[PDB]
Amino acid sequence: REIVHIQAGQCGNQIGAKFWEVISDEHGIDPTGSYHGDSDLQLERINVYYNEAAGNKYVPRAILVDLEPGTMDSVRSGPFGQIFRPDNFVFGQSGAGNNWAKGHYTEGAELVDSVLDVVRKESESCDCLQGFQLTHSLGGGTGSGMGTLLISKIREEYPDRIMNTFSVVPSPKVSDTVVEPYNATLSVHQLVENTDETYCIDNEALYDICFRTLKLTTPTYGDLNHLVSATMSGVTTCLRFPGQLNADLRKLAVNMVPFPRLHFFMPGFAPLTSRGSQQYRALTVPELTQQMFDAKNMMAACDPRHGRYLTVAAVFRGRMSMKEVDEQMLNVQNKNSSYFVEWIPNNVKTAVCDIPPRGLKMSATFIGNSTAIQELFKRISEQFTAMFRRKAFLHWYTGEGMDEMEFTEAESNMNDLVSEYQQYQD
Amino acid sequence: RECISIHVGQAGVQIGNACWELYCLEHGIQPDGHVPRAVFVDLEPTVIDEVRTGTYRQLFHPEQLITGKEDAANNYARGHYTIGKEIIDLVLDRIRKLADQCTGLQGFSVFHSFGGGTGSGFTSLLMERLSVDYGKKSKLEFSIYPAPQVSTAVVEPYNSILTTHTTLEHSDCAFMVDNEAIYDICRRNLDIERPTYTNLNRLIGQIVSSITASLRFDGALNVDLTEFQTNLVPYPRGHFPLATYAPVISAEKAYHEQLSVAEITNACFEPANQMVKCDPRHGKYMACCLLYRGDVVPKDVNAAIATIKTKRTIQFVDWCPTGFKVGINYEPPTVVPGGDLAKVQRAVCMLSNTTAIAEAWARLDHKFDLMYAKRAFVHWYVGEGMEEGEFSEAREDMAALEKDYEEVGVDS
Amino acid sequence: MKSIQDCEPTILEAQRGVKNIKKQQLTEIRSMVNPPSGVKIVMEAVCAILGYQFSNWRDIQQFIRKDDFIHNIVHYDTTLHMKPQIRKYMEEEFLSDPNFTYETINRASKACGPLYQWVNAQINFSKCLE
């Protein structure tokens, strides 16, 4: 069963830091790595995510990849730094120059072996290795270029494990680098063929939700990450606790992807509320469904209603009646009936774990697979062409040995992918 | 004497787990007396783990809780071929150390579901391997079939149409029940708003007791498994009766204890207690086996059946003159403390074969079709060893099972 | 006549065949970790034709996994009029044995057929070059 994390890049590293913060807490593991959790129930699966080093330290099995040494020295100095094993840190040395080509050839191309190794040293640890999580960001250096190179090696090494990817897709209307379309497109092409689950988080949609749904003054990058990290825990770990209907990753995936061109989901979390108005009653389930199916609770910026959904999968986690669950689901399919592709009979794939996530009385992740996500690759595709046309920064790529024709490819390719997505919209 | 039991799947173990309690409780088995007689198989550890852990640890002798470590999944193909293959052996072996142990057993209660991954796949080839080693025993399966509206999967139709054609030709007798139709009862005739897979399981846990446990209690007019198959097929096709159990009444809202044979018996025929979302009110019955248990004196019974026989709104297929085997076992129903049901003194587990189930296949056939028309999730199956044959040809089969249940009405 | 004419509607045949192969149909094909035997054998025939010779399933995954998977198929040779020694091989290994037959494979997978025709064409053409 066990499974193996990978944090590439600055974002991808940062998030990591909250994520192991989360998980750890959900098994009551100290920062030192010694267990002090609440109930035995915990401990039983830990395995999934840890390794025991010597009856005390449970060390996370992760890999931390980055070319800029300043990175790693912030994470190991964090509140949960102690918990790794130093080997796990694989830095580069060079800068992560924001150039996909510099990542995906050249510099990253050097560093690869010093990763690939470690992944085998880790794989041959135990059990049946389920898969890899890869978190990383499409904007930075190491992420789109180099990290997209990485997978292609993993997917040659174990061409049968799953690959979850959390990409921090760049929010086209709230920019932060001027190469964005180069860094996005060059990777997406590679991505769409080698990974089994991609979870797109539009960075500002993430903003929004914190400033408007939860309502905080100041959304640090730190916050956001914190919120995200609940969702990728909200998928998996969760199922690694006994429930009423345990169905994870494999199941999960194979409930979702009808055609084989991968498809990307859009995560949505659920009992998320302002601090003050947390006070007003709820938590019974219709609110959770209330949440989830709203556009302002998508962590991805396309708003569903401009698409339909193809499959949707709610992984709940508390104590409750399956009838009031199954029931909701139904209603939802009738109230928003035009938002569903028809030739799927029943869309929702309910799964229901048990254990609650710490302070909450019960929570519930949503993973929706909508055609609304066409409207993301459009944006990207636009930006690209518009500047490809004038070859704007092109030389920094060209100069590393990338032809232009790759630039055609990726574009072509990726544009056609938008195409697909509509064909099964209407 | 006894008759072994097989729980397969994410689901199936849960059912077992309830039931096996009740079952034991009924004989008053100490939570430490003579060891159970069954097995539990499933590939994803997590379910079985509970049973190695929760109360009822002692109760089984480990060997018989077989588990995979590998990814079960949720899709026939895999479950049939690929993964499941590995396990089969180990399993078969156990049932032969347990088959050879017992003397003069009778058959296999399978609990498999078309939900969980394995439930379909596995079972399919398990039942195959059974049919060869024990070609003559009895193979009665309680399956959980997927409701019309509520569903919790999207491979649902696929996952059950692949199981059907094979199970037809390996099984003797299939009970069907479905979740959706069970909840209803829990609201209406039992009045709770908390159903969980753990409540419904307590329920099925009753219907099953009416076969074994109680039969293992002598009374006025005991019945037998062959007796079933005999009285319930009506042609040689592994036919699909539907089950119903009847004095389901909420304790405390049962001071209404002026409650008799006549009522509980009449209380079966209403489609309100249908037990699967098919209303037989426009089907034809064709053979019913009313098993009673508790204080029942034959006559009443044999009168209450007359009344039914004369209620007219029920139809009954022509060419059966009489179709009511009657079972009386003695032993009052027993009630689990965690349960809801009320400690009645007589109950009726009537089962019966009806041309109505034409319904139930249709809604499910339909589903399948749509999707197959797009070739929807096909690559998940293909890529596991399944063939496109197995698809087209498992439709066609079930088509011609829909023809039998159609034909078998209107014979004159 | 100036044309040799021998097996020309085989080169209109192999050609309609290569346009019968859809790129999404390749993606569906590549995803299958372990498909029926009927699927496996067709893929072996493709390694031999493309000139990657023999392959075990493990190896086939490695091949298709390449980025030139679609590219090489859609860009493939006009005529393999050069007669490789794959010519007698592809028969001794595939056309020799009836397992490799349109029906078997087709029933195997509804995705195979066009692929099966295309391979067939590269063979029925290879007979006329002798």
Residue numbers in the entry:
A (entry chain b): 2 to 44, 47 to 360, 369 to 437
B (entry chain a): 1002 to 1413
C (entry chain M): 3095 to 3224
Sentences from the paper on this structure:
Cytoplasmic dynein is a motor protein that utilizes the energy of ATP to move along microtubules (MTs) toward minus ends. Within the 1.4-MDa complex that constitutes the dynein machinery, the heavy chain plays a central role in dynein motility. The motor domain has three structural elements: (1) the ATPase domain, composed of the six conserved AAA+modules (ATPase associated with diverse cellular activities, AAA1 to AAA6) that form an asymmetric ring-shaped ATPase domain; (2) the linker domain, which transmits the powerstroke movement to the N-terminal tail region; and (3) the stalk region, a 15-nm-long anti-parallel coiled-coil structure that extends from the AAA4 module and contains the microtubule-binding domain (MTBD) at the tip of the stalk. Furthermore, the structural mechanism of the two-way communication between the ATPase domain and MTBD remains elusive. It has been shown that the switching of the MT affinity of MTBD is achieved by changes in the association mode of the coiled-coil, referred to as “registry”.
To stabilize MTBD in the high-affinity state, the codon for I3101 (instead of S3097) was mutated to instead encode cysteine, in combination with the V3222C mutation in CC2. To elucidate the structural basis of the MT binding of MTBD, we performed cryo-EM single-particle reconstruction of MTBD-High in complex with MTs. We also analyzed the complex in the presence of DTT (dithiothreitol) to examine whether the disulfide bond formation in the coiled-coil affected the MTBD structure in the MT-bound state. Without imposing pseudo-helical symmetry on MT, the structures (including the seam) were well resolved, with a density corresponding to MTBD seen at the intradimer boundary of αβ-tubulin. Using a cut-off of 0.143 for the Fourier Shell Correlation (FSCtrue), the overall resolution for each map was estimated to be 3.9 Å and 3.7 Å in the absence (−) and presence (+) of DTT (hereafter referred as ±DTT), respectively. Since the local resolution of the cryo-EM density of MTBD is ~4–5 Å, which is not sufficient for constructing the de novo atomic model, we built an atomic model structure of the MTBD-High-MT complexes by a flexible-fitting method. In both the +/− DTT complex structures, all helices of MTBD were well accommodated within the maps. Although the density corresponding to the CC1 region was relatively weak, the CC1 helix was well fit into the map for both DTT conditions. Interestingly, we found that the DTT(−) and DTT(+) structures were very similar to each other, suggesting that MT binding, not the disulfide bond, determines the MT-bound MTBD-High structure. In addition, the good agreement of cryo-EM density corresponding to the hydrophobic interactions between CC1 and CC2 (asterisks) in both conditions suggests the similarity of the two structures and the validity of fitting.
